[PDB]
Design a protein around this nucleic acid. Structure first.
Lengths: 128, 94, 155
RNA sequence: UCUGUCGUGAGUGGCACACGUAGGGCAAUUGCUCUGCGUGCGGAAUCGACAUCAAGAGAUUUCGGA
């Protein structure tokens, strides 16, 4: 009773649609809509082993909103590869910070544009 | 009323859960179809590679898929109507 | 034979937890994750590595004790930060015991590494430090867990 | 002495609950109602946070309520 999966699979094979990770879901495609409209922006995060994950947020996204985007990206990642799914995000955000250009992103309420973050930027992790 | 609602809730909510799932593929193809459009505006330079084959292959996919989705929803709507017919039938006579 | 009770005491004579972390150790139940792989006999758990140490260098310096079947350095799941400890899986028990006796104190990237066996699936009732307990510790940090190779009991 | 339930890659997950916190609407300077986040009773000082188990930094003393 999952005929939609076959259709989604073949449609993804569109050369102008290869960016999409098999299972599409509404929030992922909608985020890339704002990418075409320019409202969104991609903020790259690199884990300390060098692996990079391209988290996408809106231009007016706040720091705390960016945090959930990482949660949304990571959580979506875990189901596809089947890793650990019950990430204790309370702990992860309790001990680690977010830093860009040597400035730690502490104010969850402040928006990334004032924190100097532009599209296609890079931010890293650091302990409390 | 509390157990009248719960009895309706037990069946009506379950049908909606599948119906919401049944609707969930519609907006997937709606959002995907939109995303296809704005990338063709950027494909004015990318249109060198054949988009007509790409567009033709894309369009025939959803239409059969959306036809099957509508066929499935007709089954679910009939049961939703039937459940609404039967559930309210019992509550008056009780 | 791990006992969170006596682990908090120098000579195994304490009958009452002197630390809430000891109390948490008794209550909490631990099972190794799905990431725990391989025969526990041959897993030489090493610790106190440098956070900049790469898993290749660990293979490079630990191959001198013999062939190495498998290796993993542990990093934080979400962040990627190295956790400062690894797990070396060897072949033949001759290699791991050689790794046991000499590699303890072996300086790697300006750090004196710590070497032990894998005590999860071998030491009864073993509880890691995260769940309260573990071994080693530092008496500076308001708590300590005796009974390990680093701090044997004062028997 | 300081919530319940379902869960085992999860003493750290899900939901609910309680308390606190940020933004929205309503009434009489205050009160009532919704969404996000923090802890599971809540503060202070000190020692740690560069500790031995596949991912998790806590602990000693102190004092406020129930």
């Amino acid at each position: 009773m999952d005929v939609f999966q076959e259709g989604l699979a073949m449609v993804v094979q569109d050369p102008l649609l290869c960016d999409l990770p098999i299972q599409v879901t509404l929030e992922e495609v909608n985020s890339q809509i704002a990418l075409e409209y320019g409202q969104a922006m991609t903020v790259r995060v690199c884990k300390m082993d060098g692996e990079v994950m391209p988290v996408v947020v809106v231009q007016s996204a706040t720091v705390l909103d960016l945090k959930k985007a990482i949660q949304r990206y990571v959580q979506l990642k875990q189901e596809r590869e089947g890793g650990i799914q019950h990430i204790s995000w309370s702990y992860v955000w309790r001990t680690y910070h977010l830093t860009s250009a040597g400035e730690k992103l502490t104010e969850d309420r402040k928006k990334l544009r004032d924190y100097g973050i532009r599209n296609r930027d890079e931010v890293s992790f650091i302990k409390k | 009323e509390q157990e009248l609602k719960a009895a309706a809730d037990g069946v009506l909510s379950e049908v909606r859960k599948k119906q919401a799932d049944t609707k969930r593929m519609v907006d997937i193809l709606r959002a995907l179809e939109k995303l296809r459009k704005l990338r063709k505006e950027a494909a004015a330079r990318k249109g060198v590679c054949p988009p007509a084959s790409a567009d033709e292959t894309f369009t025939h996919h959803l239409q059969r898929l959306r036809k099957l989705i509508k066929k499935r929803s007709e089954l679910y709507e009939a049961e939703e109507r039937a459940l609404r017919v039967m559930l309210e039938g019992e509550q008056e006579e009780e | 034979e791990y006992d969170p009770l006596k682990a908090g005491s120098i000579d195994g004579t304490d009958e009452d937890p002197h630390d809430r972390a000891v109390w948490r150790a008794m209550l909490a139940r631990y099972v190794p994750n799905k990431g725990v792989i391989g025969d526990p006999l041959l897993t030489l758990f090493v610790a106190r590595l440098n956070l900049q140490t790469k898993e290749d260098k660990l293979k490079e310096v630990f191959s001198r004790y013999g062939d190495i079947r498998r290796l993993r350095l542990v990093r934080d799941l979400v962040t990627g930060f190295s956790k400062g400890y690894a797990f070396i899986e060897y072949k033949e028990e001759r290699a791991v015991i050689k790794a046991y006796r000499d590699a303890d104190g072996l300086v790697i990237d300006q750090h004196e590494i710590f070497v032990d066996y894998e005590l999860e699936r071998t030491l009864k009732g073993w509880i890691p430090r995260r769940l309260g307990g573990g071994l080693g510790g530092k008496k500076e940090s308001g708590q300590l867990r005796f009974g390990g190779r680093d701090r044997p009991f004062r028997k």
